[PDB]
Scaffold this motif. Sequence first.
Motif, PDB file in Angstrom:
ATOM      1  N   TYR B  17      78.114  50.206  18.578  1.00 29.20           N
ATOM      2  CA  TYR B  17      79.453  50.445  17.963  1.00 29.20           C
ATOM      3  C   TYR B  17      79.275  50.719  16.479  1.00 29.20           C
ATOM      4  N   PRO B  18      78.851  51.959  16.113  1.00 29.50           N
ATOM      5  CA  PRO B  18      78.293  52.258  14.792  1.00 29.50           C
ATOM      6  C   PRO B  18      79.260  51.948  13.649  1.00 29.50           C
ATOM      7  N   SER B  19      80.562  52.074  13.904  1.00 35.24           N
ATOM      8  CA  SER B  19      81.613  51.769  12.904  1.00 35.24           C
ATOM      9  C   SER B  19      81.470  50.328  12.386  1.00 35.24           C
ATOM     10  N   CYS B  20      80.847  49.429  13.153  1.00 36.64           N
ATOM     11  CA  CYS B  20      80.668  48.001  12.752  1.00 36.64           C
ATOM     12  C   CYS B  20      79.722  47.884  11.545  1.00 36.64           C
ATOM     13  N   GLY B  21      78.879  48.898  11.337  1.00 40.39           N
ATOM     14  CA  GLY B  21      77.995  49.049  10.173  1.00 40.39           C
ATOM     15  C   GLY B  21      78.568  49.967   9.113  1.00 40.39           C
ATOM     16  N   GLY B  22      79.777  50.456   9.298  1.00 41.05           N
ATOM     17  CA  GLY B  22      80.383  51.454   8.410  1.00 41.05           C
ATOM     18  C   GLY B  22      81.189  50.819   7.296  1.00 41.05           C
ATOM     19  N   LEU B  23      82.183  51.590   6.857  1.00 37.73           N
ATOM     20  CA  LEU B  23      83.031  51.337   5.672  1.00 37.73           C
ATOM     21  C   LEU B  23      84.288  50.535   6.072  1.00 37.73           C
ATOM     22  N   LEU B  24      84.958  49.962   5.061  1.00 41.08           N
ATOM     23  CA  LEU B  24      86.239  49.220   5.206  1.00 41.08           C
ATOM     24  C   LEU B  24      86.152  48.184   6.336  1.00 41.08           C
ATOM     25  N   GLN B  25      85.046  47.412   6.423  1.00 41.28           N
ATOM     26  CA  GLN B  25      84.911  46.291   7.405  1.00 41.28           C
ATOM     27  C   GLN B  25      85.738  45.047   6.981  1.00 41.28           C
ATOM     28  N   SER B  26      86.467  44.504   7.950  1.00 38.08           N
ATOM     29  CA  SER B  26      87.213  43.230   7.888  1.00 38.08           C
ATOM     30  C   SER B  26      86.455  42.233   8.761  1.00 38.08           C
ATOM     31  N   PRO B  27      86.646  40.903   8.631  1.00 38.47           N
ATOM     32  CA  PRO B  27      87.492  40.314   7.597  1.00 38.47           C
ATOM     33  C   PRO B  27      86.774  40.109   6.255  1.00 38.47           C
ATOM     34  N   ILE B  28      87.567  39.693   5.272  1.00 43.05           N
ATOM     35  CA  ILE B  28      87.100  39.491   3.872  1.00 43.05           C
ATOM     36  C   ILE B  28      87.628  38.162   3.328  1.00 43.05           C
ATOM     37  N   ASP B  29      86.978  37.753   2.242  1.00 42.91           N
ATOM     38  CA  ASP B  29      87.435  36.616   1.418  1.00 42.91           C
ATOM     39  C   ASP B  29      88.434  37.151   0.367  1.00 42.91           C
ATOM     40  N   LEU B 195      89.163  46.957  12.558  1.00 40.41           N
ATOM     41  CA  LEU B 195      89.145  45.925  13.621  1.00 40.41           C
ATOM     42  C   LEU B 195      88.018  44.944  13.281  1.00 40.41           C
ATOM     43  N   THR B 196      88.228  43.652  13.564  1.00 39.59           N
ATOM     44  CA  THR B 196      87.234  42.563  13.352  1.00 39.59           C
ATOM     45  C   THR B 196      86.384  42.374  14.609  1.00 39.59           C
ATOM     46  N   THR B 197      86.581  43.210  15.630  1.00 40.08           N
ATOM     47  CA  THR B 197      85.792  43.287  16.895  1.00 40.08           C
ATOM     48  C   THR B 197      85.414  44.739  17.177  1.00 40.08           C
ATOM     49  N   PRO B 198      84.363  44.994  17.971  1.00 34.22           N
ATOM     50  CA  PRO B 198      84.010  46.362  18.349  1.00 34.22           C
ATOM     51  C   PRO B 198      85.181  47.102  18.964  1.00 34.22           C
ATOM     52  N   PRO B 199      85.343  48.415  18.695  1.00 34.90           N
ATOM     53  CA  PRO B 199      84.380  49.205  17.932  1.00 34.90           C
ATOM     54  C   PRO B 199      84.542  49.199  16.408  1.00 34.90           C
ATOM     55  N   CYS B 200      85.224  48.193  15.840  1.00 36.22           N
ATOM     56  CA  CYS B 200      85.352  47.981  14.366  1.00 36.22           C
ATOM     57  C   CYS B 200      85.922  49.212  13.674  1.00 36.22           C
ATOM     58  N   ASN B 201      86.793  49.981  14.330  1.00 36.38           N
ATOM     59  CA  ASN B 201      87.298  51.248  13.719  1.00 36.38           C
ATOM     60  C   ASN B 201      87.940  50.873  12.385  1.00 36.38           C
ATOM     61  N   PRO B 202      87.654  51.628  11.294  1.00 34.15           N
ATOM     62  CA  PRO B 202      88.255  51.381   9.978  1.00 34.15           C
ATOM     63  C   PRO B 202      89.673  51.962   9.895  1.00 34.15           C
ATOM     64  N   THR B 203      90.562  51.536  10.803  1.00 35.61           N
ATOM     65  CA  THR B 203      91.849  52.202  11.108  1.00 35.61           C
ATOM     66  C   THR B 203      93.040  51.263  10.911  1.00 35.61           C
ATOM     67  N   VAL B 204      92.834  50.114  10.262  1.00 34.41           N
ATOM     68  CA  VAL B 204      93.799  48.989  10.309  1.00 34.41           C
ATOM     69  C   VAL B 204      94.399  48.783   8.934  1.00 34.41           C
ATOM     70  N   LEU B 205      95.725  48.892   8.841  1.00 32.30           N
ATOM     71  CA  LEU B 205      96.430  48.394   7.640  1.00 32.30           C
ATOM     72  C   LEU B 205      96.666  46.891   7.822  1.00 32.30           C
ATOM     73  N   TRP B 206      95.925  46.058   7.090  1.00 35.01           N
ATOM     74  CA  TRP B 206      96.012  44.584   7.175  1.00 35.01           C
ATOM     75  C   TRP B 206      97.201  44.068   6.359  1.00 35.01           C
ATOM     76  N   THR B 207      97.961  43.139   6.935  1.00 38.12           N
ATOM     77  CA  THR B 207      98.980  42.282   6.257  1.00 38.12           C
ATOM     78  C   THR B 207      98.676  40.818   6.610  1.00 38.12           C
ATOM     79  N   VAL B 208      98.180  40.047   5.637  1.00 33.74           N
ATOM     80  CA  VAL B 208      97.838  38.614   5.805  1.00 33.74           C
ATOM     81  C   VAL B 208      98.841  37.819   4.973  1.00 33.74           C
TER      82      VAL B 208
END
Lengths: 260, 260
Positions: B17-29, B195-208
Amino acid sequence: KWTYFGPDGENSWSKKYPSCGGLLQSPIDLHSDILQYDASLTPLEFQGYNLSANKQFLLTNNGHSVKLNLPSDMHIQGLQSRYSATQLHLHWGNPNDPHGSEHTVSGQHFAAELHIVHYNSDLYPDASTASNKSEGLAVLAVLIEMGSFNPSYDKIFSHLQHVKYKGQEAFVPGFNIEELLPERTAEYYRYRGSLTTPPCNPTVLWTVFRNPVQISQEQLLALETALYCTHMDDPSPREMINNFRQVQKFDERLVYTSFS
Amino acid sequence: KWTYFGPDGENSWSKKYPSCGGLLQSPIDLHSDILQYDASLTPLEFQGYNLSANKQFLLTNNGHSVKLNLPSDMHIQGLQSRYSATQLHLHWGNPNDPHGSEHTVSGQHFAAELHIVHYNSDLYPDASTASNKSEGLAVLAVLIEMGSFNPSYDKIFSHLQHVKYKGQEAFVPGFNIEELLPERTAEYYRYRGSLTTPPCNPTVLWTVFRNPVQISQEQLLALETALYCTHMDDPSPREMINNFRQVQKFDERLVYTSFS
Ligand SMILES: COC(=O)c1cc(S(N)(=O)=O)c(SC2CCCCC2)cc1Cl
Ligand SMILES: COC(=O)c1cc(S(N)(=O)=O)c(SC2CCCCC2)cc1Cl
Ligand SMILES: [Zn+2]
Ligand SMILES: [Zn+2]
């Protein structure tokens, strides 16, 4: 090749270095829920740490950190085998985020982290051969906090100038490597882990001292700005910064402590 | 296959799931030095969250988490397009280390974390199709700490016994999903992530949401001990614990806040 940023980063390491996606990975977060007081954690003995200021030791930029070669006559007593030194090195952040320790305490990074790396000299002839073998390695970790100037750490840092690029090397005067150690080296954390870098072999008895040492803002700025991962003549130069791995899953482990 | 432990663990995700090694990975501190108040961040409105106790909703143990399938006329208003709900699920730790949140605040893990996953229904038929598309996904995240009993979370935890093993499924009478949200939903962190699980697509607008909700240690414990990753008749059953990704490096990038 491997890095700490982007495609060749730590999420990609496992692609090339399978133990990087294995068990018992370091580093980790030191927090109270996973600590376990252990009465068998006796003080270590630092033998042959007092290096002659009349002798020279090689400082090297390896593309990943700056490292000081140590003689195998220097060693740890107190473990199941004799562990003879091979080298020390550092991990750090960047001028904008001076928090690049590998181990955290309760989710907090320190400025930086010193690693004093030893191999099982009773089983293996060198650190390389020990590297991927049971009971191969034993690292001392020293957490580094921004604080007062450290004349002892400067015996490494005053030479960063001569190792700006991957492959560069400078001879450095011996000093008492125990001066790099914090107080109450008898208070430590102990756990089974790995190289924090490829090949991430799960072959490392970690010892992380409880108390940090201090180096100044200027020392950290120097360490964070002196060094490049790249050869002097590379046209894609990469600054040697944020050379720290994210804390890892515990895999059912505990961290035994010599203090409660 | 993919897990949160061992050979197939999160460090190995990048292999298949190559996106898991890519850009804009969540989660973060989430820490102040990377927070910037943005006054444009107005409250979201939650439409269709009040599911009738008349109607029943599918609860699935999928071997990664318990998941509640939500109806698509349930949606966020206030974003640049309409985002319709597909489900909610939780992440948690283990009874000995009850710190299982995905996002951390100043390096602190919360007990657990709830994700209500919405997809861009203006552009895409389903969340599956939206998942590898630009701005395909908006997730709402709630941080969960131990505290007072939560009758509305109990509307989910009451049924965990019906879905102990993987593939198991239970119907849950509808309730108001908005009761799973914390105090002052106007206060939130907002960033571009994955996504914080495979395929980790950098496609998520996060609201925490700024503020955690509370559940009793009894509620939290039920969740930590109630479920298994494995089928009923798996001879080697694996407890479902620690289904949370390690925080990712967050370099040369900002989290916006709706609060100053
Ligand atoms: C930035 O990281 C490093 O450069 C590094 C980091 C380690 S560590 N942190 O101790 O895992 C070792 S030890 C190892 C190197 C390869 C063979 C055995 C000794 C050597 C090195 Cl050179
Ligand atoms: C414990 O983790 C999960 O079980 C999980 C966690 C997420 S998350 N944390 O929102 O990325 C998603 S996302 C869902 C979106 C629709 C298509 C792919 C899966 C799906 C799942 Cl199945
Ligand atoms: Zn190291
Ligand atoms: Zn999730």
